[PDB]
């Protein structure tokens, strides 16, 4: 594989969790997947650790508050667009 950008559109639905952790970072704020629970709902959808979250529920990552972010991760349904790297 090479250096072209590949992105992956994911929809997850559910007491239950989605089963991934996500780090908020700056350097340029960014949202990265740290880990994905083996056998969890995000894993069956092909979410991978190190994916970068670009959009959540049709909103750009940059434009997301800790507040929209808390609210989005708590809802029963979750739409993500992620950048995914070759393996």
């Amino acid at each position: 594989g090479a250096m072209g950008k590949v992105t992956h559109s994911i929809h997850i639905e559910k007491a239950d969790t989605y089963g991934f952790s996500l780090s908020s970072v700056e350097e340029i704020r960014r949202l990265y997947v740290n880990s994905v629970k083996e056998t969890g709902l995000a894993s069956k959808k092909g979410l991978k650790a190190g994916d970068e979250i670009l959009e959540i529920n049709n909103r750009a990552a940059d434009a997301l508050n800790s507040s929209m972010l808390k609210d989005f991760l708590s809802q029963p349904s979750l739409g993500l667009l992620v950048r995914t790297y070759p393996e």
Partner: peptide, 8 residues
């Protein structure tokens, strides 16, 4: 610099 970690 890590600001927050969410366990979703």
């Amino acid at each position: 610099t890590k600001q927050e970690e969410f366990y979703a």
